[PDB]
Design a protein around this motif. Structure first.
Motif, PDB file in Angstrom:
ATOM      1  N   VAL A   1      11.573  11.037  78.710  1.00 16.96           N
ATOM      2  CA  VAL A   1      11.742  12.463  78.481  1.00 16.96           C
ATOM      3  C   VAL A   1      12.957  12.606  77.583  1.00 16.96           C
ATOM      4  CG1 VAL A   1      12.309  14.655  79.549  1.00 16.96           C
ATOM      5  CG2 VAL A   1      10.605  13.098  80.647  1.00 16.96           C
ATOM      6  N   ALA A   2      12.750  12.837  76.276  1.00 21.29           N
ATOM      7  CA  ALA A   2      13.875  12.842  75.299  1.00 21.29           C
ATOM      8  C   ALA A   2      14.645  14.147  75.167  1.00 21.29           C
ATOM      9  CB  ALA A   2      13.356  12.452  73.908  1.00 21.29           C
ATOM     10  N   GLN A   3      14.094  15.279  75.660  1.00 18.60           N
ATOM     11  CA  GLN A   3      14.737  16.565  75.517  1.00 18.60           C
ATOM     12  C   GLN A   3      15.607  16.748  76.696  1.00 18.60           C
ATOM     13  OE1 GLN A   3      11.279  16.211  75.325  1.00 18.60           O
ATOM     14  NE2 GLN A   3      10.700  16.869  73.245  1.00 18.60           N
ATOM     15  N   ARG A   4      16.848  16.346  76.497  1.00 17.41           N
ATOM     16  CA  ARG A   4      17.876  16.493  77.534  1.00 17.41           C
ATOM     17  C   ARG A   4      19.060  17.383  77.148  1.00 17.41           C
ATOM     18  NH1 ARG A   4      16.373  14.318  82.619  1.00 17.41           N
ATOM     19  NH2 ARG A   4      14.815  12.633  82.173  1.00 17.41           N
ATOM     20  N   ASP A   5      18.808  18.398  76.319  1.00 18.81           N
ATOM     21  CA  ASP A   5      19.845  19.382  76.073  1.00 18.81           C
ATOM     22  C   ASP A   5      19.283  20.788  75.888  1.00 18.81           C
ATOM     23  OD1 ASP A   5      19.159  19.402  73.377  1.00 18.81           O
ATOM     24  OD2 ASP A   5      21.131  18.902  72.574  1.00 18.81           O
ATOM     25  N   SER A   6      18.076  21.043  76.408  1.00 19.36           N
ATOM     26  CA  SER A   6      17.472  22.358  76.241  1.00 19.36           C
ATOM     27  C   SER A   6      17.856  23.289  77.399  1.00 19.36           C
ATOM     28  CB  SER A   6      15.931  22.218  76.169  1.00 19.36           C
ATOM     29  OG  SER A   6      15.600  21.638  74.936  1.00 19.36           O
ATOM     30  N   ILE A   7      17.651  24.589  77.214  1.00 21.06           N
ATOM     31  CA  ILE A   7      18.035  25.580  78.252  1.00 21.06           C
ATOM     32  C   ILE A   7      16.785  26.286  78.759  1.00 21.06           C
ATOM     33  CG2 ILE A   7      20.294  25.949  77.151  1.00 21.06           C
ATOM     34  CD1 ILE A   7      19.148  28.714  76.062  1.00 21.06           C
ATOM     35  N   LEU A   8      15.690  26.227  77.988  1.00 18.73           N
ATOM     36  CA  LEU A   8      14.435  26.904  78.415  1.00 18.73           C
ATOM     37  C   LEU A   8      13.201  26.142  77.952  1.00 18.73           C
ATOM     38  CD1 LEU A   8      15.216  30.636  77.241  1.00 18.73           C
ATOM     39  CD2 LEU A   8      14.928  29.966  79.735  1.00 18.73           C
ATOM     40  N   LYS A   9      12.117  26.238  78.738  1.00 17.16           N
ATOM     41  CA  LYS A   9      10.813  25.857  78.183  1.00 17.16           C
ATOM     42  C   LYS A   9      10.103  27.169  77.886  1.00 17.16           C
ATOM     43  CE  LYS A   9      10.204  21.432  80.597  1.00 17.16           C
ATOM     44  NZ  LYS A   9       9.385  20.158  80.606  1.00 17.16           N
ATOM     45  N   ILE A  10       9.450  27.256  76.713  1.00 21.64           N
ATOM     46  CA  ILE A  10       8.769  28.542  76.341  1.00 21.64           C
ATOM     47  C   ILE A  10       7.290  28.248  76.362  1.00 21.64           C
ATOM     48  CG2 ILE A  10       8.522  30.446  74.649  1.00 21.64           C
ATOM     49  CD1 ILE A  10      11.604  29.814  75.506  1.00 21.64           C
ATOM     50  N   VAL A  11       6.505  29.032  77.138  1.00 22.96           N
ATOM     51  CA  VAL A  11       5.061  28.765  77.252  1.00 22.96           C
ATOM     52  C   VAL A  11       4.328  29.998  76.750  1.00 22.96           C
ATOM     53  CG1 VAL A  11       3.145  28.095  78.823  1.00 22.96           C
ATOM     54  CG2 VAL A  11       5.513  27.287  79.306  1.00 22.96           C
ATOM     55  N   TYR A  12       3.390  29.799  75.842  1.00 26.54           N
ATOM     56  CA  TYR A  12       2.614  30.865  75.206  1.00 26.54           C
ATOM     57  C   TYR A  12       1.235  30.766  75.796  1.00 26.54           C
ATOM     58  CZ  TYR A  12       6.471  30.553  71.870  1.00 26.54           C
ATOM     59  OH  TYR A  12       7.719  30.561  71.328  1.00 26.54           O
ATOM     60  N   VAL A  13       0.663  31.865  76.294  1.00 25.09           N
ATOM     61  CA  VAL A  13      -0.628  31.710  76.994  1.00 25.09           C
ATOM     62  C   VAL A  13      -1.536  32.825  76.599  1.00 25.09           C
ATOM     63  CG1 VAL A  13      -1.837  31.595  79.291  1.00 25.09           C
ATOM     64  CG2 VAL A  13       0.687  31.001  79.069  1.00 25.09           C
ATOM     65  N   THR A  14      -2.825  32.565  76.449  1.00 21.94           N
ATOM     66  CA  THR A  14      -3.806  33.653  76.451  1.00 21.94           C
ATOM     67  C   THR A  14      -4.948  33.252  77.357  1.00 21.94           C
ATOM     68  OG1 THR A  14      -5.255  35.047  75.141  1.00 21.94           O
ATOM     69  CG2 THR A  14      -5.070  32.712  74.358  1.00 21.94           C
ATOM     70  N   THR A  15      -5.537  34.207  78.074  1.00 16.37           N
ATOM     71  CA  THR A  15      -6.662  33.892  78.973  1.00 16.37           C
ATOM     72  C   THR A  15      -7.780  34.870  78.744  1.00 16.37           C
ATOM     73  OG1 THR A  15      -5.801  35.195  80.774  1.00 16.37           O
ATOM     74  CG2 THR A  15      -5.051  32.928  80.708  1.00 16.37           C
ATOM     75  N   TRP A  16      -9.006  34.450  79.023  1.00 16.23           N
ATOM     76  CA  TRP A  16     -10.147  35.328  78.826  1.00 16.23           C
ATOM     77  C   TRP A  16     -11.325  34.830  79.620  1.00 16.23           C
ATOM     78  CZ3 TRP A  16      -8.260  31.536  75.799  1.00 16.23           C
ATOM     79  CH2 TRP A  16      -9.145  30.575  75.297  1.00 16.23           C
TER      80      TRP A  16
END
Ligand SMILES: *Cc1cc2c(nc3c(=O)[nH]c(=O)nc-3n2C[C@H](O)[C@H](O)[C@H](O)COP(=O)(O)OP(=O)(O)OC[C@H]2O[C@@H](n3cnc4c(N)ncnc43)[C@H](O)[C@@H]2O)c(*)c1C
Ligand SMILES: *Cc1cc2c(nc3c(=O)[nH]c(=O)nc-3n2C[C@H](O)[C@H](O)[C@H](O)COP(=O)(O)OP(=O)(O)OC[C@H]2O[C@@H](n3cnc4c(N)ncnc43)[C@H](O)[C@@H]2O)c(*)c1C
Ligand SMILES: CC1=CC(=O)[C@H]2O[C@]1(C)O[C@H]([C@H](C)/C=C(C)/C=C/C(O)=C1\C(=O)CNC1=O)[C@H]2C
Ligand SMILES: CC1=C[C@H](O)[C@H]2O[C@]1(C)O[C@H]([C@H](C)/C=C(C)/C=C/C(O)=C1\C(=O)CNC1=O)[C@H]2C
Ligand SMILES: [Cl-]
Ligand SMILES: [Cl-]
Ligand SMILES: [Mg+2]
Ligand SMILES: [Mg+2]
Lengths: 487, 492
Positions: free
Chosen positions: B384-399
């Motif tokens: 897991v190389a991302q060791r300095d982030s503050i948020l994960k951003i998740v974009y979703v659409t459902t139907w």
């Protein structure tokens, strides 16, 4: 292990999934075997400490968390589901959840049990209360597959022992097996595991569900709904179920729940599931949906999906929304016929009055449940068409009285002509012990002259009392509405 | 011996995972009961030339398992045990176990837990080796930060299958293979049978994994969309962004807070946020209130706010945290790591695309608290190389309507491309973003039509970890038996 106050696990394990009730046990024992259960029991009986069993923690009442209970046996470590080659049946330990039972039986063997909607429910309380669900019209109650049970019991002298009781008439413990076919949890002893199969290949020893189902969600807006419209919808539904719930009805393969919600919610709704195996399945679904909306004057939004069967059991439309936080009060009744006009009038007034989230759900029932003779198991209601569930939920722990009163008044008023309770043998057939309600034993709310025990068990009660006298003479296993010998 | 072919009553369920968009065509689904059974399915499939895939929890957001070219599936449902392995001194989790069973068994039995996913239905099989995180990650790191050893069935050059054990011990001969399981992602190296987990840091099971808080405060905050203009929306997003920029260091006292801010379509009627905070300090309520006050300051819209105090295990099954459990219908997910919060143009684009009447009529951008103790770990220590982030951003659409995939896929493609337009349409690492998370996979990151950044999909997910993952691939899966879109692949 053993869990006492101060342990990091205590706040969770002192509770079930009903947050209204906080237990005060001195010890919670995560028992690992019949032998450990016998040691916790014999030790509690010697100390005079009151005990209770927790499996899935779904009790709607305070039977396990009651403040007098000093010792809890929690069955979480005993959650195995598998086929037992020795007994030629499926073995479900008490702590197994229904979602684990259905996943294991179906993925591994292609079979199922017709128990509850609601994957988080435990086998322990569910089976010996008479569990039923979406497939019950097609396949009967889960107790209709109970072949044998292992239960730890306490004798007159206070020693605990493990016994096996089975469906075979010659079994010396046959009477104890019969009491586990709907007698209710917390009455006779500690169930360790149940063995289930049809009355020698596992794939052939329990029913096969449909491979796929049609699922429909129909919603009527409340804004444009007057009393006559509401009354026609309710009457349409009740007439359909009066006609189409016999044990030989083609409609045994349909299940539905019609939710009569408070008007403030914005909409009334109904969920339906139909075996999709037949190529006319879609036409049959529509004819049921058309019957429910005929002459209502409000067009419903309707959507229908075909889903693989195991996937459907986890859809919140059938399974419920999984939210066990906040506070809830349940009441319920068996219906042999649907509500009369005056009762419909009561429902409409109480659902639209601004005097609170609350719903009256009508759950399809009968079908193959009703092929069983009323005395064959301890599930005595074998001619009903619907279970009716009254529910109110809230959040503020300081406001219990007002929500309890709302639902108390609604239920009393619906059943007012029979002393405020659904007296058996009329339009109603009494009550279901897995939806327990202590108010059925409360002189202030039950004015029918019919005791709580006859409302839950009808004529099965004397036999259950005899099993009680034989197998739990000390009355170690008790709670409000527990089977109790005559005084 | 337990196998499901077309025409079997179980085939419709077992040919699918939990993503209904994806319908598999395998000739056989094997309900394997042991490592030896996995070896015999693999060796036969390899000698036949039949493409294989593994299914544990079935939660894959992409078509990695259900791809129509997959001929043989190994379904791990029967391998679902969770327990303590005394001889190893570590907790054993078989790949078919769901996170719900994991947390229940570890907590009720031993009073410990793993800082993995929210979402009780997710399987351990795909979730741990993709670098699983959740509500407890800011306090305790990623679930891979407790992976001590793995058992995996692998295939050698000659096409024979065997079972190996790989551990975190530096001198272990299979140490490289262990490393690739701390974030390398599912369906790449071989079939994991079980994971063994323990703190790296006394040999009592109750002290070998982190204890969770005994109780948490849980808050749901809702802002009506009705009276909410662009300036008000932008202030809320900026408030939340700044707070996370300031309060996500590995030594922050706020490591004990987690939250999800949902930027919903205005059609939905409301914007919402869920917050969990360790309730065991006596000033927990005042601390929660300061976080909520920071998010709402000067927004000009009063939120409706509901706080409840819950025992910890009970909290993990509350849908506010766990999600609603509804895996029917169809969904498309995209995602990114954030090192800093959204800029003006990005906030503008979100506002426009969340309030616009275009396409058909659902969607959401969810900003998930991250960082904290995750970021105490050197970037190269795990996969897991991302060791300095503050948020994960998740974009979703459902139907719902299976004839309407294009408009929904297009909506979310254009929204994401627009957000990351200044870097070729994708979250290029080492800037405001830090790439993408392999447990939220999105094949458009390898699609020239959607990635114009010049940075390959592999650097976006793995950063500098990729050449080492490739070396593990060459050594342990030389035949490339284990593959899918976005699978680790040796150099051409
Ligand atoms: C919360 C909930 C309940 C549901 C749901 N859906 C149902 C459905 O579709 N059909 C149903 O028939 N019932 C549904 N129910 C109700 C449940 O059936 C009842 O709430 C069951 O009694 C619950 O069983 P369990 O989850 O095990 O509850 P506990 O609270 O542990 O026990 C209840 C009661 O039984 C005694 N008991 C438990 N375990 C044992 C053993 N091993 N031996 C003897 N007695 C036992 C307890 O002491 C207690 O008295 C859907 C939802 C969401
Ligand atoms: C649906 C869902 C997913 C979630 C949820 N919440 C999460 C959270 O709070 N944090 C997270 O980090 N992730 C969350 N996720 C995503 C899951 O983490 C991913 O979707 C996991 O990859 C899912 O794992 P699993 O359920 O096991 O999915 P599969 O589809 O079986 O596998 C995916 C991928 O991995 C390979 N694989 C599975 N099993 C193995 C084994 N034993 N060995 C090697 N490879 C394996 C599969 O082939 C496939 O390639 C919340 C929700 C509701
Ligand atoms: C169909 C069905 C059958 C059941 O036998 C049970 O499950 C289902 C889904 O629904 C039944 C009934 C109609 C619904 C109920 C009671 C709703 C409960 C609820 O919302 C809450 C709580 O219990 C605690 N906190 C809550 O919010 C119920 C009796
Ligand atoms: C907080 C979460 C972390 C996990 O990483 C996952 O879980 C949580 C609860 O939320 C995440 C995201 C915000 C929501 C999603 C994808 C919603 C999905 C969704 O509605 C659906 C499906 O996925 C299929 N049908 C559907 O209807 C998701 C990635
Ligand atoms: Cl009681
Ligand atoms: Cl693929
Ligand atoms: Mg509810
Ligand atoms: Mg959804």
């Amino acid at each position: 292990d053993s869990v006492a106050p101060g342990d990091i696990r205590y706040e969770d394990l002192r509770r079930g999934e009903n947050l209204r009730f906080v237990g005060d046990p001195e010890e919670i024992h995560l028992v690992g075997s019949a032998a450990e259960i016998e040691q916790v029991l014999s030790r509690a009986v010697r100390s005079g400490k009151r005990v209770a069993v927790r499996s899935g923690g779904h009790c709607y009442e305070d039977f396990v968390a009651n403040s007098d209970v000093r010792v809890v046996m929690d069955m979480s470590r005993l959650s195995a589901v598998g086929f037992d080659e020795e007994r030629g049946a499926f073995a479900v330990e008490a702590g197994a959840t229904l979602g684990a039972v259905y996943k294991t039986l179906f993925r591994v063997w292609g079979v199922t049990l017709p128990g509850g909607a609601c994957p988080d429910v435990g086998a322990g309380g569910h089976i010996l209360g008479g569990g039923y669900g979406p497939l019950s019209r097609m396949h009967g109650s889960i107790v209709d597959y109970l072949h044998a049970v292992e239960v730890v019991v306490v004798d007159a002298s206070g020693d605990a022992r493990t016994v096996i009781a089975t469906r075979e008439p010659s079994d010396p413990n046959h009477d104890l097996w019969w009491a586990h076919t709907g007698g209710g949890g917390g009455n006779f002893g500690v169930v360790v595991r149940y063995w289930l199969r049809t009355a020698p290949e596992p794939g052939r020893l329990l029913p096969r569900p449909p491979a796929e189902v049609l699922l429909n969600t129909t919603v009527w807006p409340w804004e444009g709904l007057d009393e006559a419209a509401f009354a026609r919808l309710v009457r349409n539904h009740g007439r359909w179920f009066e006609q189409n719930s016999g044990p030989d009805s083609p409609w045994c393969d349909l299940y539905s729940v019609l939710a009569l919600t408070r008007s403030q919610s914005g909409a009334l709704a109904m969920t339906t599931q139909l075996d999709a195996t037949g190529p006319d399945a879609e036409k049959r679904l529509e004819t049921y949906l058309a019957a429910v909306s005929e002459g209502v004057g409000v067009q419903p939004h309707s959507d229908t999906r075909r889903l693989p069967w195991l996937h459907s059991t986890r859809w919140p439309g059938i399974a419920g929304d999984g939210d066990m936080t906040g506070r809830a009060k349940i009441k319920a009744a068996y219906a042999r016929r649907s509500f009369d006009d005056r009762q419909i009038g009561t429902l409409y007034t109480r659902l639209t009055s601004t005097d609170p989230a609350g719903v009256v759900a009508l759950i399809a029932y009968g079908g193959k449940v009703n092929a069983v003779p009323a005395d064959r198991t301890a599930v005595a209601q074998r001619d009903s068409i619907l279970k009716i569930v009254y529910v109110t939920t809230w959040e503020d722990p300081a406001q219990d009285p007002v929500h309890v009163r709302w639902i108390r008044e609604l239920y009393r008023d619906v059943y007012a002509d029979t002393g405020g309770v659904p007296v058996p043998g009329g339009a109603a057939d009494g009550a279901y012990v897995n939806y327990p309600d202590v108010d059925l034993a409360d002189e202030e709310w039950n004015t029918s002259g019919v005791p709580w025990s006859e409302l839950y068990y009808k004529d099965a009660y004397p036999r259950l009392q005899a099993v009680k006298a034989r197998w739990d003479p000390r009355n170690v296993f008790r709670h409000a509405l527990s089977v109790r010998v005559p005084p």
